[PDB]
Write a protein that binds this ligand. Structure first.
Ligand SMILES: CCCCCCCCCCCCCCCCCC(=O)OC[C@H](COP(=O)([O-])OCC(O)COP(=O)([O-])OC[C@@H](COC(=O)CCCCCCCCCCCCCCCCC)OC(=O)CCCCCCCCCCCCCCCCC)OC(=O)CCCCCCCCCCCCCCCCC
Ligand SMILES: CCCCCCCCCCCCCCCCCC(=O)OC[C@H](COP(=O)([O-])OCC(O)COP(=O)([O-])OC[C@@H](COC(=O)CCCCCCCCCCCCCCCCC)OC(=O)CCCCCCCCCCCCCCCCC)OC(=O)CCCCCCCCCCCCCCCCC
Ligand SMILES: CCCCCCCCCCCCCCCCCC(=O)OC[C@H](COP(=O)([O-])OCC[N+](C)(C)C)OC(=O)CCCCCCCCCCCCCCCCC
Ligand SMILES: CCCCCCCCCCCCCCCCCC(=O)OC[C@H](COP(=O)([O-])OCC[N+](C)(C)C)OC(=O)CCCCCCCCCCCCCCCCC
Ligand SMILES: CCCCCCCCCCCCCCCCCC(=O)OC[C@H](COP(=O)([O-])OCC[N+](C)(C)C)OC(=O)CCCCCCCCCCCCCCCCC
Ligand SMILES: CCCCCCCCCCCCCCCCCC(=O)OC[C@H](COP(=O)(O)OCCN)OC(=O)CCCCCCCCCCCCCCCCC
Ligand SMILES: CCCCCCCCCCCCCCCCCC(=O)OC[C@H](COP(=O)(O)OCCN)OC(=O)CCCCCCCCCCCCCCCCC
Ligand SMILES: CCCCCCCCCCCCCCCCCC(=O)OC[C@H](COP(=O)(O)OCCN)OC(=O)CCCCCCCCCCCCCCCCC
Ligand SMILES: NC(=O)C1=CN([C@@H]2O[C@H](COP(=O)(O)OP(=O)(O)OC[C@H]3O[C@@H](n4cnc5c(N)ncnc54)[C@H](OP(=O)(O)O)[C@@H]3O)[C@@H](O)[C@H]2O)C=CC1
Ligand SMILES: CCCCCCCCCCCC(=O)OC[C@H](COP(=O)(O)OCC[N+](C)(C)C)OC(=O)CCCCCCCCCCC
Ligand code: SF4
Ligand code: SF4
Ligand code: SF4
Lengths: 342, 45, 318, 49, 176, 155
């Protein structure tokens, strides 16, 4: 934090925030909001990308001249990771996938890449490390996604002890895979649900809430070495959450129960797609997994962020799924879902 | 030396046309209709 | 062997449409002191391939306000009917030899307007709607006149069979006895194909892109493909009507060569006319075909019903 | 007959470009098969006509 | 003096009326327009084969900036800041100090090529022909940062285009 | 190898896109006059396969030729968002690059890159019609280097 890393300005795009951040996986859902918030205050952002430069274009307006720097990196190349972090004061790890490719398994992107980044960051002298785990991560889950998340969350602690590990619940937003996933089930007629969605409880959180918590953790000096659980203000049943989704979108809602084994066989069929699968056996498990209640972990309120209710910010996500008949329906037209009081 | 400048030639420049010049063409109205009817009569026959 | 015959019809039509786009871009270029496509392939011979591939790997989007079923049906209807106008064409042997070929093409032409009306209405955009209602106005302008013009030419031929027009014009072209009808037929085909100076349903300078303003990618290509396949088809119809070619049963190839050239030159004239004239107003088009053509078309319909009778030259019924 | 002179000029372009390989190279590299007097060549191989 | 553009009366003699009737019915004046575009089809197009043929320019062309040197190799700029003061767009930023040998030289010479309006005032104001607009007009970039030139970029432009810049000045300095 | 075949398909689609660029008919200020001269006979952008189309939905390129004001900024992003992908933006002139002569104005957006992403910057006030045509040819070579399918294959 020498002379060039002293804050200046009034928090604008042409200010100097003093933050030099390397955001891995910045081309995805949770990464476009983090870069947007960092560049709003005038931060130096390094964005190592694996994909075509055409797919990084939406990130370019997010910063003043020279503030967003793009590098090409490989998850299995330890030298590329070092080039992208050796000048940074904070490293943010957002790498993840909801499916498995021929080249990267769940444990390749949740156990190995997170550990490789953490090790190189410590060897490079990086001061802050922010790792995004999952709320429902544990070694004894039915999902490799969550099983691998728990392992990765442990390797990071052993490599970067001062890391700040954040464990969000399912995140809903515009470019999400949670509310859009449920709405797009309408193509298949009915909405299958394991146990008819009556035995699953979900506590979704808003993307801006997660984005403001990560930014606060960077600036807050007491977030080092502390594990946070970013969850929403209300707990819903999966049946009520999905029913509310179809109510906002004004689409017919025709649920029907489906045995857990049957929903896996269907998921196996969809996994054959050589592109982004519509659904996988892992997503079915994740969707039908009760969100853990971790009272021992600090939450968003401990970083100064007020959790946004789903109702206030669900129409902005689901207005796209309505027909011309129901595009203009107002926010106050759909009664709120039923919550699970403590 | 002598002053050298971008100047017109000693005798000036040649004439430059600017007026509209749309030449008269074609046959007369009588001739065109005469040719038109003659084509029809041959076609009918 | 009939399925092969259909493929030997639709597939060449699409290739003809693809390279008519190149011909138009270069013909207009040279009439505008330019060159046109000469980089993508030698003399721009690969330009149609690039444009086709570009559009079909581009994102197609349905407007949020659109009626999805009508939005997708319309481009299908335009191309499907565009290819259907070709099956009764004698060149010199038709694919589907219809006894009422002339009437079949009229009905199909009228049905193909709804691909414009429904595309514009399904778009749910003001510019798409305005262009669609110009199609209603434009079809009200020529449809009545275009039918009587055909009727006057069939009173010298004998029937509605298109193959019979080859027999009618065996001694002489029909453009000599009916050049007044040929003039009003030619300008009526420009209106029917939505071509300049009657390109009002699209009207780039007035309506951005008209009825197909919301269409993009592949769906836009079908409207483009149908429009150009209609220019060639209508110019083939004009050649058969007024520039009939002599048919030798033992050398049918010689017919196609002469018949093909007459259609190209009539097709070039469409490109020639687009580069020479401004655009009508869609209310002036109606007055053109109702106050000038229609009075003369009715007079020439009376004349061509009386002329065979008063000269004992009524054509055979069969 | 200058109509024949047009064809000979078109054929001289084939011979003026060093054969058929050269004629096609310039056609597909520059979309232009004209032949002009050579003015010079720079150290990078660029030729000026 | 003036003249009427559309004050005319058509002759009403029968031959003239019939000539207009033929024009209305036979579309004579619409076929002249066809004849005019037909002639253009047979005229040689005016299209040059870019990038192999380039449109003509003149020595006064105002293109990409460059910082020049003397024949000795010494920089011509002596940090007078006249170009900075006259720049209409405030595209020039200069800082100077005594050099190790005592000379008056700039430690900063930045031109924001996205503020510049390529007007030529800076080269008109320079007393020692240090800053010039060269003949280069092909320097498009893929990023906004590549157009914020500093003294190192501008000196390289001078060392790059000197063979051409010095000749263009030679052909025009007697008009300045 | 399978990465060789995708590379050839990647070349094919890349060729189809840079050979059929259709700019949106979108001009703002003096820089649009030099955009017309590119379509004029001398340069004839149409011979490269570049054709203007008025509808944003039938366009592949947005050439921001002229000054961008705060009143016009919402409209520019709207017609950009409505272009189907893939879409490219070419910033023409100093006004659209960094505000140009009006950088310090209360009603001028300091660079169109604050509103939309930009692929090629053409400097000049105005750039010559031969400088814009150079910029479009640089865009084509930038599309030739895209390897979408060789990156999908390696996922
Ligand atoms: C038999 C019908 C008996 C009457 C049905 C009940 C009457 C409901 C009355 C409610 C009311 O007042 O409004 C009408 C009611 C609701 O209208 P609205 O919400 O007021 O206004 C917008 C419309 O809904 C418009 O909404 P939309 O545009 O989203 O409609 C989508 C879908 C309607 O959505 C569906 O109903 C499709 C899903 C049902 C089939 C799947 C059942 C689950 C099967 C298990 C899953 C297996 C998957 C395997 C893969 O309808 C279709 O478009 C497909 C019809 C294609 C037919 C060809 O309209 C309906 O959707 C019900 C009719 C659906 C059946 C169509 C029968 C067509 C005739 C055959
Ligand atoms: C000898 C045999 C030869 C016989 C020859 C005779 C040939 C017959 C003539 C040719 C047939 C033409 C049929 C007319 C077209 C249908 C009429 C129509 O547009 O209604 C739309 C109407 C409104 O749906 P919509 O436009 O999607 O709603 C507006 C929303 O904004 C829409 O927004 P959205 O958000 O819902 O859009 C999303 C959706 C959009 O999906 C689509 O874009 C549908 C694409 C369909 C393309 C159809 C053209 C091919 O994407 C999907 O998820 C796809 C799955 C959902 C189902 C799609 C809806 C199916 C509607 C029925 C079709 O759909 C219905 O209400 C269906 C009711 C049943 C209609 C039948 C009444 C017509 C009676 C006359 C025909 C006689 C029946 C036999 C004819 C067939 C012979 C077997
Ligand atoms: C949406 C797209 C739907 C298809 C568009 C075509 C519409 C129907 C076409 C009419 C067919 C016709 O009249 O052929 C005459 C032609 C005219 O020929 P003809 O009357 O001279 O007789 C031929 C045989 N001789 C001369 C020996 C008697 O009929 C035929 O050539 C063969 C008739 C075969 C039988 C066809 C009837 C079944 C087809 C019904 C389809 C109805 C679909 C309507 C949907 C409309 C909604 C858009
Ligand atoms: C400005 C727009 C309006 C003008 C549009 C004109 C476009 C159509 C051009 C038609 C010109 C006549 C055709 C000449 C070129 C093709 C001639 C041909 O291939 O057939 C030989 C034709 C004759 O072939 P034919 O088979 O038609 O025989 C003459 C007609 N019958 C059958 C009655 C004997 O020769 C000529 O056209 C010479 C004139
Ligand atoms: C390429 C290969 C050659 C292409 C074919 C040759 C080009 C033919 C069209 C361009 C003709 C050149 C322009 C010209 O001379 O016209 C001026 C002339 C002059 O027109 P004007 O408007 O100046 O007045 C002439 C008549 N008075 C004076 C009485 C008003 O125009 C004509 O005379 C054209 C008459 C032809 C009328 C034919 C119409 C009916 C067509 C029926 C279909 C056949
Ligand atoms: C597409 C349409 C192409 C028609 C183009 C016809 C050519 C017109 C033309 O030749 O114009 C130029 C020519 C000038 O010659 P000149 O008379 O010496 O000019 C000075 C006179 N003041 O003017 C002429 O000499 C006119 C020569 C052509 C005249 C043609 C006769 C008029 C026919 C009108 C009836 C149309 C119907 C005829 C039947 C057609 C069926 C095939
Ligand atoms: C003007 C309209 C008529 C246009 C010409 C009609 C076609 C034609 O010319 O036919 C001429 C034909 C000649 O007979 P032809 O073919 O030689 O038969 C012998 C074969 N061995 O003979 C015919 O077919 C028609 C012969 C009659 C001429 C047609 C017009 C009717 C004549 C009415 C006479 C009354 C006086 C007319 C003047 C007053 C009317 C205002
Ligand atoms: C028409 C036949 C030609 C008559 C003609 O031109 O003779 C000259 C005569 C006097 O002409 P002028 O003194 O200039 O003014 C007209 C005064 N009535 O002109 C006249 O007086 C004629 C008076 C008009 C009567 C005819 C009006 C109806 C239209 C006739 C169409 C004529 C053209 C048809 C094509 C003829 C060639 C086939
Ligand atoms: N429902 C949710 O969104 C939840 C998110 N999380 C976690 O937050 C992080 C981001 O989530 P989200 O944005 O929604 O998912 P996205 O798919 O939208 O983002 C994934 C990012 O990681 C990159 N990535 C994936 N695999 C690799 C790989 N082998 N090598 C390099 N980069 C790779 C991607 O690069 P590219 O796109 O260029 O291929 C992309 O930038 C993840 O760690 C996720 O587990 C945890 C709780 C809830
Ligand atoms: C309606 C008919 C089509 C339905 C959809 C199914 C076909 C989809 C095309 C891709 C399938 C696939 O995976 O292609 C596999 C093949 C070869 O296989 P590989 O390299 O050994 O597999 C590696 C699988 N990766 C990529 C997940 C690692 O890749 C190619 O080079 C094909 C690309 C061009 C396809 C033709 C255009
Ligand atoms: S050319 Fe004009 S605007 Fe550009 S740097 Fe020189 S004085 Fe400033
Ligand atoms: S006017 Fe010339 S000498 Fe003065 S500061 Fe500018 S470049 Fe240097
Ligand atoms: S950059 Fe120059 S030519 Fe372009 S709009 Fe601005 S002042 Fe006008």
């Amino acid at each position: 934090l020498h002379h060039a890393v002293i804050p200046h300005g009034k928090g604008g795009r042409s200010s100097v925030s003093g933050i030099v951040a390397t955001v891995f996986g910045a081309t995805g859902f949770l990464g476009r909001y983090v870069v947007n918030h960092l560049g709003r205050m005038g931060s130096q952002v390094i964005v190592p990308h694996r994909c075509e430069p055409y797919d990084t274009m939406h990130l370019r307006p997010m910063g003043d001249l020279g503030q967003i720097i793009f590098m090409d990196w490989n998850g299995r190349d330890k030298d590329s990771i070092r080039r992208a972090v050796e000048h940074s004061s904070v490293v943010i790890n957002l790498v993840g996938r909801e499916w498995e490719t021929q080249n990267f398994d769940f444990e390749d992107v949740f156990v190995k890449i997170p550990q490789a980044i953490a090790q190189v960051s410590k060897e490079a002298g990086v001061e802050k490390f922010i790792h995004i785990s999952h709320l429902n991560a544990d070694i004894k889950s039915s999902s490799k996604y969550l099983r691998s998340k728990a392992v990765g969350e442990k390797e990071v602690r052993e490599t970067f002890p001062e890391a700040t590990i954040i464990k969000p619940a399912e995140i809903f937003g515009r470019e999400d895979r949670f509310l859009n996933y449920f709405a797009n089930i309408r193509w298949f007629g009915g909405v299958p649900l394991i146990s008819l969605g009556k035995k699953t409880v979900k506590q979704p959180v808003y993307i801006v809430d997660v984005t403001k918590g990560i930014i606060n953790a960077i600036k807050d000096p007491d977030a080092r070495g502390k594990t946070f659980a970013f969850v929403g203000p209300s707990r819903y049943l999966l049946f009520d959450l999905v029913q509310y989704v179809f109510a906002v979108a004004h689409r017919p809602f025709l649920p029907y129960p489906l045995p857990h084994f049957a929903y896996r066989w269907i998921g196996r069929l969809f996994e054959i797609s050589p592109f982004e699968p519509w659904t996988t056996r892992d997503k079915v498990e994740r969707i039908h997994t009760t969100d853990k209640i971790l009272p021992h972990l600090p939450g968003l309120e401990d970083l100064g962020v007020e959790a946004t209710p789903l109702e206030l910010k669900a129409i902005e996500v689901l207005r796209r799924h309505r027909t011309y008949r129901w595009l203009s329906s107002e926010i106050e037209d759909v009664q709120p879902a039923k919550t699970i009081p403590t | 030396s002598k002053v050298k400048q971008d100047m017109p030639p000693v005798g000036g420049y040649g004439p430059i046309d600017y007026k509209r010049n749309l030449p008269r063409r074609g046959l007369s109205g009588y001739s065109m209709f005469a040719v038109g009817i003659g084509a029809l009569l041959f076609g009918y026959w | 062997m009939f399925m092969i015959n259909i493929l030997m019809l639709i597939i060449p039509i699409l290739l003809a449409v693809a390279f008519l786009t190149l011909v138009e871009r270069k013909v207009l270029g040279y009439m505008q002191l330019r060159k046109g496509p000469n980089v993508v392939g030698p003399y721009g011979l690969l330009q149609p391939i690039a444009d086709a591939i570009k559009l079909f790997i581009k994102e197609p989007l349905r407007p949020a306000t659109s009626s999805a079923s009508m939005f997708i049906l319309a481009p299908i209807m335009a191309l499907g009917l565009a290819l259907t106008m070709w099956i009764p064409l004698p060149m010199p042997y038709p694919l589907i030899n219809m006894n009422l070929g002339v009437l079949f093409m009229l009905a199909m032409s009228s049905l193909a307007v709804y691909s414009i009306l429904w595309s514009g209405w399904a778009s749910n955009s003001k510019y798409a709607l305005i262009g669609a209602l110009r199609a209603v106005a434009q079809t009200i302008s020529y449809e009545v006149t275009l039918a009587i013009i055909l009727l006057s030419v069939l009173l010298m031929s004998g029937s509605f069979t298109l193959s019979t027009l080859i027999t009618t014009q065996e001694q002489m072209w029909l453009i000599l006895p009916a050049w007044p009808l040929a003039m009003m037929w030619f300008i009526s085909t420009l209106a029917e194909t939505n071509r300049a100076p009657f390109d009002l349903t699209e009207g780039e300078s007035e309506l951005v892109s008209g009825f197909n303003v919301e269409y993009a990618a592949g769906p836009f290509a079908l409207f483009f493909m149908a429009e150009y396949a209609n220019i060639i088809m209508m110019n083939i119809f004009t050649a058969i009507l007024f520039l009939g070619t002599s048919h030798n049963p033992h050398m049918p190839e010689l017919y196609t060569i002469n018949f093909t050239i007459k259609s190209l030159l009539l097709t070039m004239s469409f490109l020639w006319i687009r580069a020479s004239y401004p655009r009508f107003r869609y209310d002036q088009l109606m007055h053109l075909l109702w106050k000038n053509f229609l009075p003369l078309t009715l007079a020439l319909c009376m004349w061509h019903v009386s002329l065979p009778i008063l000269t004992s030259g009524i054509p055979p019924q069969t | 007959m200058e109509l024949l002179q047009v064809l000979k000029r078109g054929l001289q372009q084939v011979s003026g470009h060093g054969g058929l390989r050269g004629y096609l190279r310039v056609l597909f590299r520059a979309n232009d098969v004209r032949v002009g007097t050579l003015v010079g060549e720079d150290k990078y191989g660029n030729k000026y006509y | 003096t003036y003249k009427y553009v559309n004050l005319r009366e058509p002759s009403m003699d029968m031959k003239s009326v019939t000539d207009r009737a033929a024009q209305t019915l036979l579309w004579t004046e619409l076929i002249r327009g066809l004849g005019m575009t037909l002639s253009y089809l047979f005229r040689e197009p005016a299209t040059i084969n870019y990038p192999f043929e380039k449109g003509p320019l003149s020595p006064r062309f105002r293109g990409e900036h460059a910082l020049r040197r003397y024949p000795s190799g010494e920089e011509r700029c002596i940090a007078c800041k006249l170009c900075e003061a006259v720049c209409p767009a405030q595209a020039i930023t200069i800082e100077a100090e005594p050099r190790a040998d005592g000379s008056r030289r700039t430690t900063r010479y930045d031109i924001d090529m996205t503020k510049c309006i390529y007007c030529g005032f800076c080269q008109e104001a320079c007393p020692v022909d240090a800053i010039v607009e060269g003949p280069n007009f092909e320097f498009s970039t893929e990023t906004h940062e590549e157009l914020l030139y500093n003294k190192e970029k501008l000196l390289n432009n001078g060392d790059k285009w000197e063979a051409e810049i010095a000749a263009n000045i030679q052909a025009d300095y007697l008009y300045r | 190898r399978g990465e060789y075949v995708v590379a050839k398909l990647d070349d094919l689609i890349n060729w189809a896109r840079r050979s059929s660029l259709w700019p949106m008919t979108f001009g703002l200020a003096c820089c649009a006059v030099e955009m017309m001269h590119m379509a004029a006979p001398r340069y004839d952008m149409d011979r490269f396969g570049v054709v203007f189309r008025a509808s944003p939905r039938q366009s592949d390129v947005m050439i921001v030729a002229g000054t961008l004001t705060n009143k016009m900024a919402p409209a520019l992003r709207k017609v950009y968002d409505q272009m189907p992908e893939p879409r490219y933006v070419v910033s023409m002139g100093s006004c659209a690059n960094g505000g140009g002569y009006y950088h310090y104005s209360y009603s001028v957006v300091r660079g169109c890159d604050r509103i939309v992403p930009v692929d090629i910057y053409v400097p000049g006030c105005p750039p010559t019609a031969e400088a814009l045509l150079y910029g479009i040819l640089q865009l084509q070579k930038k599309i030739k280097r895209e390897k979408r399918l060789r990156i999908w294959y390696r996922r």
